[PDB]
Design a protein around this ligand. Structure first.
Ligand SMILES: Nc1ccn([C@@H]2O[C@H](COP(=O)(O)O)[C@@H](O)[C@H]2O)c(=O)n1
Ligand SMILES: Nc1ccn([C@@H]2O[C@H](COP(=O)(O)O)[C@@H](O)[C@H]2O)c(=O)n1
Lengths: 316, 317
């Protein structure tokens, strides 16, 4: 049990790096590994990693979570924030196992919107043990030479004492890289759903079959070992997400830009204005426009620190 | 971490009973509950409960596991061993979420034999992290008033240091009743698969979203709280033996045949599977009111004799 994700993240990283159970090479990727590992977070909203040596990217973290909420499998959207994710696209256009959006909202088994069914299940029986979003699909292992097999099995939500608890079940999790964005996204979905249901945030449980540090990340993991997040507004945030996704697409494609004062004047809750400002900052970097230091100064300090460490030549 | 399932079972039972995180009533079923609970077994073959107050039914244990291997969803097979299970059959003929057989061997999401794909995956890449059998299906929540939604999410197998390790992921588990047969079945499938792959047995991990004791079981669970090795399955491909065992299972369940102690010893089966068919003949004696055979009983492994003697003491005690 940990208070924040960063404490759990660093504890687990130390366990795997210094006390691995196995050394092996699944699909040729040499790794340190432990089997059957998990942790509990008492405060899932505190979902960010701020250790400067880790250079956690809060823009990618929100982008991935909103990519899921958009229901999209398109590579162009997410590789803009994480160019290396193109390695898992067989067609150069879409992602399969990596794209949890379609798994949540139009699952390959029947096209089912599982998020809606979970909300209906919890509304009809608040104590339900059945409110599960299935991610994995049985046909993924029937694909020959599949380069992108879902590694999350399911997400479960439970309403307990007026709080929404969440459980993420994964068959495998990269303890150094993937875990940072997976726990961010799963606790983001948990909070989003809690707000929608009018509930407080309960605990988050992460449970993983194989937790591992790839040997190719050993040096960076060692640098990290040698070294408040704001709350989403109450209620139904879908209208805000739709507007943020509109700004996301226009900024990513450089079809729009917004100054610091334009951002502050957007008709959005402050929480979501800051997410749009992250995307405008990222546009300045990727499309080589003038970095806006007034933009940076208006962000929450957690975001300011992420930007200054990720892009010190722009925001440092 | 526990040496045997019985140690983990009793420890989890006492944890839920004495220190439940929640008391609630999903679908109106009042319970004591803990969230996100798991354990690790070092010896998954030692999968049985031998506390007499629990009256664990090794015949049902093997019947459920073989029902899964048969790929069947039929109620008539399994309700013969567990009469109350018909409460989860909407049509009186089949089981849905309770029937893991079709989920393993012909999953409704594409008609996929996942066991075959797991064996192929682990043969092509022994270190694979992908060898997962999915059980739950997203369409199960799509219609209201479903009385039988799968509570197992997935089973994963990993080859680590030449040993087949298993992980069962469940969204919910009855810690007092269902967990006894679920862990039996999952570690049985683990051992079966390891023998097929020519591997030894590693660890088994059980992880469950909601683990609970139903209030209606509290009296029995209190009695259990107030209160011999399991044999190893033979090496190699046990499918041909399973097929023969299933032929005998149906003949005995329908009272179309009977097996004397000498008829059991003459079966063309490894000793391990002869004992399983003997369990079915003993069960036939119970269900069809035939003479309890003392000689059958004496030839069984000690673990099985104790289960029969406690469960049906007038027949086998
Ligand atoms: N969301 C994701 C997607 C992939 N991953 C990583 O990618 C790997 C995919 O390779 P396998 O399919 O071989 O497992 C996982 O084992 C895990 O290391 C992750 O940790 N989180
Ligand atoms: N294999 C199975 C099948 C059912 N069960 C029990 O049946 C219940 C089914 O009800 P829910 O669908 O409400 O969970 C589970 O919560 C669990 O108590 C089990 O423990 N093992």
């Amino acid at each position: 049990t940990f208070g924040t994700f960063q404490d759990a993240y660093l504890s687990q990283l130390r366990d795997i790096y210094h006390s691995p159970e196995f050394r092996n090479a699944p699909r040729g990727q040499a790794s340190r590994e432990r089997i059957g590992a998990g942790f509990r977070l008492l405060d899932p909203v505190q979902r960010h990693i701020s250790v400067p040596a880790r250079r956690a990217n809060v823009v990618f973290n929100f982008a991935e979570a909103l990519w899921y909420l958009s229901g999209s499998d398109r590579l162009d959207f997410i590789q803009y924030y994480a160019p290396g994710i193109a390695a898992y696209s067989a067609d150069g256009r879409t992602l399969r196992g990596t794209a949890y959006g379609p798994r949540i909202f139009r699952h390959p088994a029947g096209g089912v919107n599982q998020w809606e069914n979970v909300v209906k299940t919890l509304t009809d029986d608040p104590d339900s043990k059945r409110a599960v979003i299935q991610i994995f699909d049985p046909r993924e292992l029937a694909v020959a030479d599949n380069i992108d097999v879902a590694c999350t099995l399911a997400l479960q939500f439970l309403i307990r004492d007026g709080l929404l608890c969440g459980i993420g079940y994964m068959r495998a999790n990269d303890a150094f890289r993937g875990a940072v964005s997976d726990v961010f996204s799963f606790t983001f979905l948990q909070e989003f759903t809690a707000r929608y249901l009018g509930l407080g945030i309960g605990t988050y449980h992460h449970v993983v079959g194989s937790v591992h540090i790839y040997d190719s990340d050993a040096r960076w993991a060692e640098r990290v070992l040698d070294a408040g997040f704001p709350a989403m507004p109450d209620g139904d945030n879908w209208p805000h997400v739709r507007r943020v996704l509109e700004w996301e697409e226009r900024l990513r494609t450089n079809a729009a830009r917004l100054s610091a004062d334009a951002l502050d004047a957007l008709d959005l809750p402050a929480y979501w204005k800051h997410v749009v400002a992250l995307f405008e900052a990222h546009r300045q970097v990727r499309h080589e426009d003038t970095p806006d230091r007034a933009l940076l100064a208006a962000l929450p300090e957690v975001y300011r620190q992420s930007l200054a460490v990720k892009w010190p030549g722009h925001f440092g």
